[PDB]
Amino acid sequence: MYYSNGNYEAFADPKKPAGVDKKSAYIIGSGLAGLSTAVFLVRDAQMKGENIHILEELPVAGFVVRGGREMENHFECLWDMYRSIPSLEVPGASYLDEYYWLDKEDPNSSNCRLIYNRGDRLPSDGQYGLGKCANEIVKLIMTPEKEIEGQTIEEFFSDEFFKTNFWTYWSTMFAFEKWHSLAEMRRYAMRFIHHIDGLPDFTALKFNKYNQYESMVKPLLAYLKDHGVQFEYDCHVKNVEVDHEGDSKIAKKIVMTQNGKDKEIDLTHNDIVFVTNGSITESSTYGDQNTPAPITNAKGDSWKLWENLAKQDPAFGHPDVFCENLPERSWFVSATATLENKKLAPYFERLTKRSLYDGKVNTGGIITIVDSNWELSFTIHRQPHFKSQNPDQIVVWIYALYSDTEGNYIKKRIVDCTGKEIAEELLYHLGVPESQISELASEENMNTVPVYMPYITSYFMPRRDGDRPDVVPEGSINLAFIGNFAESPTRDTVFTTEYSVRTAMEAVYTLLNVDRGVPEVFDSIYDIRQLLRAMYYMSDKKKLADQDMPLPEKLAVKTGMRKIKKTWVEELLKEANLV
Amino acid sequence: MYYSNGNYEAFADPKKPAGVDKKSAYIIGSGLAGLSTAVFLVRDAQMKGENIHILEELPVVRGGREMENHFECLWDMYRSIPSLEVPGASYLDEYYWLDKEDPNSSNCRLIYNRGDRLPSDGQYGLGKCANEIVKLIMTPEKEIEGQTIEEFFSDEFFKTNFWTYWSTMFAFEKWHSLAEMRRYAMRFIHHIDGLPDFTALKFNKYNQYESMVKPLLAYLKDHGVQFEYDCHVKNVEVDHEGDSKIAKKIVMTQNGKDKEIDLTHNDIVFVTNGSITESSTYGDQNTPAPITNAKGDSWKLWENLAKQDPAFGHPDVFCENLPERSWFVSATATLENKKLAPYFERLTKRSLYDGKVNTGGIITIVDSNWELSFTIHRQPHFKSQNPDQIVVWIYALYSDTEGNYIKKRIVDCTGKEIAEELLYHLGVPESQISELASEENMNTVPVYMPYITSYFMPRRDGDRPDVVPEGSINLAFIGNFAESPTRDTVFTTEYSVRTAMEAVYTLLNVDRGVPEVFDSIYDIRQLLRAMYYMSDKKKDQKIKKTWVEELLKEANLV
Ligand SMILES: CCCCC/C=C\C/C=C\CCCCCCCC(=O)O
Ligand SMILES: [K+]
Ligand SMILES: [K+]
Ligand code: NA
Ligand code: NA
């Protein structure tokens, strides 16, 4: 397979690859990576739909894990996929079209990103406030990824850096903890460089009409069903037995339980197996208005399956680094709070400066309470987020970056709180008078459901050589790993739906010999215009000569500025507002 | 309107723009820019086809150029055009699959000495003259207004293989626009690895009319687009109201009769200003093409517009006082049997008769006095060719020099004489040349095109009108003499399509991005790669060293 960019390869359709009529696919896991794998097999490999088998764990607001993340314009592979998927909401258009038009009619932005002091906007909200710490980000970008394997974010950055607005925005919007992968943080800084101008106000974000299941999954299900793709339910895959001959690796048998019955699927080299290794949602537990979600570190089918594959070959990854020994401080709890009436509306509208009731964007993404002990953030998407909402209901999402600290108002770790308690802590930080908080958080007014997710932070655990298996392991004849614990050969970023679609595309194009380019990760880190733009924005719009940096670097900059005067390079710096 | 890049904007379909149902379009000129205007109007503006009027000068030449992968706008258009040759597929798909099955490359780019490959063929051979190219890219465009190529480069630069390759493949003459040469060097930086062997180039299956024009005509006719024939537009009368400019009347002769079309601000006029093919003449095997500098309908129309507003450009800059040395003559030689085939096959090392690429682009005879180049596309180039016919294209960069064998300037030569000069340079024994170039064996037809080099004349700000002039309510200029706001390069079909897209999206308020010029000049990987290939692959041209290597490896540069 090969990588490409530009419209010629984007718009081109591949020829049907040789041999595909003889082949079948077994997709283990029906999350976005698996569904996307089926799409590329149907559309591009031209595999017969009835030869594609999606093995699904499940059988044939308040729901917190039907929920998803924002996207951005440069999700190159994901948009390649969704332009071919009919919209369910807009008949006659693609899903891309629905989303593009929605984004044009109701563009995303935040009027208030950071609050403190029980409801005041942080006075420096909007500013990165990096000062000389910006140099640290530059130094990270200039440090090769192979030099920083296993290292954490806090091992690299200064104490000062973690006190900056930049770190607040970054850690909260991406869910980076200080003990997470430095290499992944570097990948994010490179990957999303083109959006440095749009991070504090979230103008860089785009969102679906509805919750992820409704908006992103249902159109895929409809498309796959329409092409005769086979869905197997109540499937619990215990293992994929892999044969070794020479340097070749061949999936030989799928071992599973389905409808309570032990089954095996015998495979040949023409049966292609795609494994979603690992899960960030598995083992989630649920509380309710009056009950905490039970704390657990149980492993389910996904983690066990990866363990069983890992035992068979050193190239099949190391699940333990992602699912074992996560710190107590990790993000675990997310909650949805349903406002049942309009009593609390003014406490949110005073922040967003927008009506909650007009169907358009509200918070524009998370608001973070910077002096909350939990590092509590909340967001209100455009509404309704669930089509089942009555017209008076508004659904608020609530999350805590720190799980080991007692709250400011409710003196408990978030992991020990009922839904009502989580709501009470929020209301406290919104400025609701304390005498009203108990009533305003009670069921007549709000219903709040917490979920404890042991592995929600797992994608970002520091990685060493071999921890993630290659999408197509060397010598693999008919076996791929897909999803956000697989190792794409690119520098793409995990905890994104783009990465799921990418691994699907790379797996299918590689194993089925699809003769069309896979888009490279969008090359903004190599675009001089974006490098210069980022240095302008990151410094809170200082000219390059005025930016705080160690004196030898400052001297180097002055010398260089003299070297390029009156040249095209100077025009590029002027265009970037750096001179 | 706005510029974009990436797949999100590429794949997105625009909403139907407000007010389009009350609007019509008048497209003056049916070259590629005009047809492309109509495609964007139908597909993206959703203007009714019956409200789109293409005014065609002809009642009722065929040859075009290569393309490359980063023709972003042109591929945006052709992915929506059904292929005529491969039913069920887009034209882009036809072309993409063909390019994969029969990829283009040249095994012989430069020849001399009556049929030897030049010994340094394949090398740029720039040496320190490479610095001059760097200097040019580092010179702001605003500093080189009106300058010519020969005003900037050293005598030594013009002796380099680089200049031979560049001048002949792009038809840059020494007195042409330096700014445009700079734009070509920046625009096509991503293909520096592929210029001497033409692996950068892609070609249609057939001649430009058959391959590029016919599918457009089918698409537009299928959508109800109106074609008006034998239209000779003499003027577009433009009113001025405050700062606004509004096309008010089209004045034209159609079918022997004078007519006027009255316009409102909802009738959108797209003018292809100027033409490189206008006033072309044809000779035959035994007759030179008649020589001329006549201005025709297109030049006269641009002049009549230029008179009405200083924002409407200055055609005289491009169409007057072209040097006698300019390229004027192209010829097609049809081989009627296989008697001459070895003289081409010895060069290409490929059979002429297997339907696959042959010369891969022009071969230039570096020691010919005319600077004669010739190409043999994949065959047949015309569907009407009999199986034993092979069509060869021939051009001369210099029109003011006597040939080496035929002692005449190309502009004074019959088809047969142009063939004889070619066969001389292929190493055919001179005693055999007259018979082998005779009609039983070769039939050669010369064309004289007075304006073929006009796109590249040195220009200043304002000489090309903006695609949508400031304050224009319903008038656009399209094609390769209009000024796109980008750094894009003329003498390309890509530029035609770009101006069409810019004009339509601007005047009709289409809310979708127009792809920016592909940004390879800003991609540091390409800056580094270009330095490597331009120097003929030179390296030459501690802990930190190791991190630099690791970074380069991380970016696949090593
Ligand atoms: C999001 C931040 C992006 C800002 C731009 C990033 C990088 C700019 C490009 C490289 C800077 C060139 C100087 C390299 C510094 C080397 C210092 C060192 O020897 O360690
Ligand atoms: K709103
Ligand atoms: K051939
Ligand atoms: Na930016
Ligand atoms: Na296509």
From TrEMBL, chain B:
What Pfam families does this protein map onto? Answer: MCRA
Q: Which N-terminal residues, if any, form the signal peptide?
A: none
A single Gene Ontology molecular function, please? oleate hydratase activity
Coiled-coil residue spans: none
Q: Which GO terms describe its biological process?
A: fatty acid metabolic process
InterPro entries, sorted: FAD/NAD-bd_sf, Oleate_hydratase
User: What name goes with this protein?
Assistant: Myosin-crossreactive antigen
Q: Which organism's genome codes for this protein?
A: Lactobacillus acidophilus (strain ATCC 700396 / NCK56 / N2 / NCFM)
